[PDB]
Structure 1
Amino acid sequence: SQYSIQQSLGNASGVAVSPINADATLSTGVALNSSLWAGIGVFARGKPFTVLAVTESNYEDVLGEPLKPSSGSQFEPIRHVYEAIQQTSGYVVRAVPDDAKFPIIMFDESGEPAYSALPYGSEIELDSGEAFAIYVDDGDPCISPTRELTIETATADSAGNERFLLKLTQTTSLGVVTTLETHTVSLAEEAKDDMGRLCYLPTALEARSKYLRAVVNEELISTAKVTNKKSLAFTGGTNGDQSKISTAAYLRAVKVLNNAPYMYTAVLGLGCYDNAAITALGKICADRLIDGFFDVKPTLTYAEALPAVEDTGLLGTDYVSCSVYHYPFSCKDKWTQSRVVFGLSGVAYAAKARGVKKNSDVGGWHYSPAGEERAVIARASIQPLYPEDTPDEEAMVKGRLNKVSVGTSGQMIIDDALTCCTQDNYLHFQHVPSLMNAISRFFVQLARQMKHSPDGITAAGLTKGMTKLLDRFVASGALVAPRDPDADGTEPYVLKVTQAEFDKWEVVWACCPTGVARRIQGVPLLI
Structure 2
Amino acid sequence: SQYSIQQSLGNASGVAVSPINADATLSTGVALNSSLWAGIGVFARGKPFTVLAVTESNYEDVLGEPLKPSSGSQFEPIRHVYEAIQQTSGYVVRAVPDDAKFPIIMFDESGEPAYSALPYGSEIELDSGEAFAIYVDDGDPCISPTRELTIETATADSAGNERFLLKLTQTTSLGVVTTLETHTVSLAEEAKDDMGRLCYLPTALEARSKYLRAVVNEELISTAKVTNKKSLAFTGGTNGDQSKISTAAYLRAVKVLNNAPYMYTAVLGLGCYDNAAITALGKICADRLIDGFFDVKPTLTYAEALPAVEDTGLLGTDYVSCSVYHYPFSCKDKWTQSRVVFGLSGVAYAAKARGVKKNSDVGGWHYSPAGEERAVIARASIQPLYPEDTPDEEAMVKGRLNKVSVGTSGQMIIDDALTCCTQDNYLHFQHVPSLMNAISRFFVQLARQMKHSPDGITAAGLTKGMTKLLDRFVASGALVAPRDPDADGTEPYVLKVTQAEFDKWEVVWACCPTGVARRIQGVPLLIK
Cα gap change, 1:483 to 1:15, in 2 (>3 Å):
closer
8 Å CA contact 2:33, 2:360 repeated in 1: no
Deviations 1:16-51 (A, max 9, x none): 999999999999999999310000100000000000
The alpha carbon displacement at 1:464 in A equals 1.2
Deviations 1:303-335 (A, max 9, x none): 000000000111111111010011100000011
Cα gap change, 1:163 to 1:22, in 2 (>3 Å):
farther
Cα gap change, 1:32 to 1:503, in 2 (>3 Å):
closer
Could you say what secondary structure the match of 2:456 adopts?
A: coil
Could you say what secondary structure the match of 1:53 adopts?
A: coil
For 1:18 and 1:387, how far apart are their aligned partners in 2?
A: 78
8 Å CA contact 2:67, 2:75 repeated in 1: yes
The alpha carbon displacement at 1:500 in A equals 2.2
For 2:8 and 2:96, how far apart are their aligned partners in 1?
A: 35
The alpha carbon displacement at 1:357 in A equals 0.5
The alpha carbon displacement at 1:123 in A equals 1.1
8 Å CA contact 1:28, 1:57 repeated in 2: no
Cα gap change, 1:116 to 1:11, in 2 (>3 Å):
farther
The alpha carbon displacement at 1:6 in A equals 67
After the TM superposition, which of the residue ranges 33-42 and 229-238 deviates more from structure 2? Answer: 33-42
For 2:42 and 2:9, how far apart are their aligned partners in 1?
A: 36
The alpha carbon displacement at 1:519 in A equals 1.5
For 2:119 and 2:455, how far apart are their aligned partners in 1?
A: 57
After the TM superposition, which of the residue ranges 380-389 and 493-502 deviates more from structure 2? Answer: 493-502
Cα gap change, 1:184 to 1:30, in 2 (>3 Å):
farther
The alpha carbon displacement at 1:501 in A equals 2.6
8 Å CA contact 1:97, 1:242 repeated in 2: yes
The alpha carbon displacement at 1:429 in A equals 0.8
8 Å CA contact 1:109, 1:131 repeated in 2: yes
8 Å CA contact 2:163, 2:184 repeated in 1: yes
The alpha carbon displacement at 1:408 in A equals 2.4
The alpha carbon displacement at 1:162 in A equals 1.2
Cα gap change, 1:29 to 1:357, in 2 (>3 Å):
same
The alpha carbon displacement at 1:224 in A equals 1.1
For 2:463 and 2:108, how far apart are their aligned partners in 1?
A: 69
When normalised by structure 2's length, the TM-score is 0.92
The alpha carbon displacement at 1:2 in A equals 69
8 Å CA contact 1:31, 1:55 repeated in 2: no
1:455 matched to 2:455: yes
Cα gap change, 1:42 to 1:154, in 2 (>3 Å):
same
For 1:260 and 1:34, how far apart are their aligned partners in 2?
A: 18
The alpha carbon displacement at 1:407 in A equals 2.6
For 1:93 and 1:87, how far apart are their aligned partners in 2?
A: 19
For 2:13 and 2:501, how far apart are their aligned partners in 1?
A: 72
For 1:195 and 1:337, how far apart are their aligned partners in 2?
A: 50
Cα gap change, 1:111 to 1:29, in 2 (>3 Å):
farther
Cα gap change, 1:30 to 1:345, in 2 (>3 Å):
farther
The alpha carbon displacement at 1:486 in A equals 2.2
Name the structure 2 match of 1:206.
206
After the TM superposition, which of the residue ranges 450-459 and 276-285 deviates more from structure 2? Answer: 450-459
1:84 matched to 2:64: no
The alpha carbon displacement at 1:295 in A equals 0.3
The alpha carbon displacement at 1:7 in A equals 67
8 Å CA contact 1:30, 1:57 repeated in 2: no
8 Å CA contact 2:132, 2:214 repeated in 1: yes
Cα gap change, 1:283 to 1:320, in 2 (>3 Å):
same
1:125 matched to 2:100: no
For 1:33 and 1:489, how far apart are their aligned partners in 2?
A: 30
8 Å CA contact 2:293, 2:322 repeated in 1: yes
For 2:13 and 2:432, how far apart are their aligned partners in 1?
A: 61
After the TM superposition, which of the residue ranges 405-414 and 315-324 deviates more from structure 2? Answer: 405-414
For 2:173 and 2:260, how far apart are their aligned partners in 1?
A: 38
Deviations 1:234-271 (A, max 9, x none): 00000111011000000000000111111000110111
Cα gap change, 1:20 to 1:87, in 2 (>3 Å):
farther
After the TM superposition, which of the residue ranges 481-490 and 276-285 deviates more from structure 2? Answer: 481-490
8 Å CA contact 2:190, 2:198 repeated in 1: yes
Deviations 1:135-184 (A, max 9, x none): 00111111110111111111111111111111111111121110111111
8 Å CA contact 1:31, 1:56 repeated in 2: no
Cα gap change, 1:406 to 1:503, in 2 (>3 Å):
same
8 Å CA contact 2:33, 2:357 repeated in 1: no
8 Å CA contact 1:33, 1:89 repeated in 2: no
After the TM superposition, which of the residue ranges 194-203 and 451-460 deviates more from structure 2? Answer: 451-460
The alpha carbon displacement at 1:454 in A equals 3.0
Deviations 1:105-145 (A, max 9, x none): 00000101000000002210001111001000111111110
Gaps of 5+ in 1: none
8 Å CA contact 1:155, 1:163 repeated in 2: yes
8 Å CA contact 2:359, 2:476 repeated in 1: yes
After the TM superposition, which of the residue ranges 404-413 and 81-90 deviates more from structure 2? Answer: 404-413
After the TM superposition, which of the residue ranges 186-195 and 103-112 deviates more from structure 2? Answer: 186-195
For 1:155 and 1:30, how far apart are their aligned partners in 2?
A: 51
The alpha carbon displacement at 1:456 in A equals 1.9
8 Å CA contact 1:29, 1:56 repeated in 2: no
1:317-328 paired onto structure 2 within 5 Å: 317-328=317-328
1:157 matched to 2:157: yes
8 Å CA contact 1:100, 1:239 repeated in 2: yes
Cα gap change, 1:7 to 1:310, in 2 (>3 Å):
farther
Name the structure 1 match of 2:383.
383
8 Å CA contact 1:27, 1:57 repeated in 2: no
For 1:18 and 1:59, how far apart are their aligned partners in 2?
A: 53
Cα gap change, 1:353 to 1:3, in 2 (>3 Å):
farther
Deviations 1:469-521 (A, max 9, x none): 11111111011111112221111111111122333311111111110111223
For 1:151 and 1:11, how far apart are their aligned partners in 2?
A: 73
Deviations 1:187-234 (A, max 9, x none): 110111121111111011111112111100001111111111110000
Gaps of 5+ in 2: none
RMSD of the alignment, in Å? 13.6
Name the structure 2 match of 1:243.
243
For 2:342 and 2:21, how far apart are their aligned partners in 1?
A: 31
When normalised by structure 1's length, the TM-score is 0.92
Could you say what secondary structure the match of 1:282 adopts?
A: helix
Name the structure 1 match of 2:467.
467
Cα gap change, 1:11 to 1:263, in 2 (>3 Å):
farther
Deviations 1:269-304 (A, max 9, x none): 111110000010001001111111000001000000
Cα gap change, 1:7 to 1:455, in 2 (>3 Å):
closer
8 Å CA contact 2:315, 2:420 repeated in 1: yes
8 Å CA contact 1:32, 1:89 repeated in 2: no
Cα gap change, 1:524 to 1:3, in 2 (>3 Å):
farther
For 1:11 and 1:453, how far apart are their aligned partners in 2?
A: 29
Identical-pair percentage? 100
